[PDB]
Amino acid sequence: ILSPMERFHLKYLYVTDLATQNWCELQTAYGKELPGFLTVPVTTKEDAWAIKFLNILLLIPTLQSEGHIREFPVFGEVEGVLLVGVIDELHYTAKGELELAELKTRRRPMLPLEAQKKKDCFQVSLYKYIFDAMVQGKVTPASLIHHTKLCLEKPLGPSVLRHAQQGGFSVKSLGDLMELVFLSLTLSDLPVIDILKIEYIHQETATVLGTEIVAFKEKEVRAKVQHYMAYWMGHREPQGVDVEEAWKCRTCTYADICEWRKG
DNA sequence: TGAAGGG
Ligand code: SF4
Ligand code: NA
Ligand SMILES: [Sm+3]
Ligand SMILES: [Sm+3]
C-alpha cells in the first residue's frame, strides 16, 4: 500500500511539520488526514516559487551589507523529502558570527515546558541543517524540480515579471531565476550559521520569559530526522506520546478517535 | 499547496 506522503497528496513538508512531530507524531498524522480541525497575487506554483526566489535574491545582499534580515526562506531535500520553511531572523553578531534568532510569543507570561523547548530546539536545528546545505551547494535545482514538479520554461506570470523588472531584473524563464538563486546562495561568501537562539516573549508585557541557546550536534539532528522521515516515506508506523507525557492527550483534538492512548 | 502557529 501507499505512503503517508502519497496518502495525503503531499509533495513536500514544512519545517514545523517535523517540529510538531516531535510533540506527537500521531497527532501530526491526524492533522494531515483530517485537515479541517487545525503583497503580490499568484496561483500557479511556478509563480509562487518565483516569488520565493526573488525574495532570496534581495535578502542575500541585504544580509551581507546591512547585517540582518527577516523571514528568510529555506528549502532542501532531507532524507528523501523536500523540507520547506522560513527563518524568523538572521543577523551578524558584534564579533562577526551569523546568528539565527527564533521568536516565540506566548499568550500568558509563563515559562515554556521542556516538551515545548525540545520541539523548538529541533525546529531551529532544522533551519540550520537546511540553511547550511543551501549555502554549501548541497541543494540543487534538480532536487527542487524532482519533488515539486515545477516546469522550468513555462514563462513567468505577468505579476512576477512586473515586480522583477521593478527591482532591476531582466529575467525571463524560471530556470534563469533558479540558476541565479543557487549562484547567489553558494558564491556570496555566506557562512554557515554559528549560533541558534530561541527567545520566549510575552508580547503584552514585552517581558522576556527565557532564552535558549541551542547546542547544535549534526549527528543527533540527522539521526532524529532520519527517524521522523521514515514515517512519511512509509517505512514504520506512527508513534503516539510516551506514557510519561500522557497529559498532551488532555487537549488533543483527536483524543476521542485515537487508539494509541487507549492501547 | 503562503509557513508558522502554540501546547
Ligand atoms: S490522543 Fe495523545 S497519543 Fe493520540 S494523537 Fe493525541 S496527543 Fe497523540
Ligand atoms: Na516567521
Ligand atoms: Sm511578513
Ligand atoms: Sm517564530
**Rounded distance between C-alpha atoms, residue A99 and residue A59, angstroms:** 15
Domain that holds residue A120: 4-87+112-189+225-251
**Rounded distance between C-alpha atoms, residue A139 and residue A59, angstroms:** 18
Name the experimental technique. X-ray
Domains identified in chain A, total number: 1
A39: in domain: yes
List the A86 CA – B3 C1' distance (angstroms): 7
Report if CB A84 to strand B is under 7 Å: yes
Report if CB A86 to strand B is under 7 Å: yes
* Residue A192: DSSP 8-state: P
Residue A202 main-chain phi, psi, to 5 deg: -85, 105
- Residue A102 assigned to a binding site: yes
Strand partners, A105: A201
| Angle between helix A25-33 and A218-233 (nearest 10) | 40
Distance A102 CA to ligand 2 centre (A): 8
**Rounded distance between C-alpha atoms, residue A13 and residue A87, angstroms:** 15
Half-sphere exposure (Cβ direction) of A242: Cα atoms closer than 13 Å? 5
**Rounded distance between C-alpha atoms, residue A165 and residue A152, angstroms:** 19
**Protein residue nearest nucleotide B4, by CA to C1':** A16
A257 neighbors A26 (Cβ within 8 angstroms): no
| A241, A242, A247, A256, best to mutate for ligand 1 pocket (most atoms within 8 Å of CB) | A241
Grid cell at residue A203: 508580547
A96: in domain: no
A211: in domain: no
In one-letter notation, the amino acid at residue A228 is: Y
| Strand extents, DSSP E, A47-194 | 68-78, 81-92, 98-106
A21: in domain: yes
A219: in domain: no
**Strand pairing report for A195-202 and A98-106:** parallel
A231: in domain: yes
| A25, A27, A33, A243, best to mutate for ligand 1 pocket (most atoms within 8 Å of CB) | A27
A16 neighbors A231 (Cβ within 8 angstroms): no
A220: in domain: no
A119: in domain: yes
**Protein residue nearest nucleotide B2, by CA to C1':** A48
A123 neighbors A21 (Cβ within 8 angstroms): no
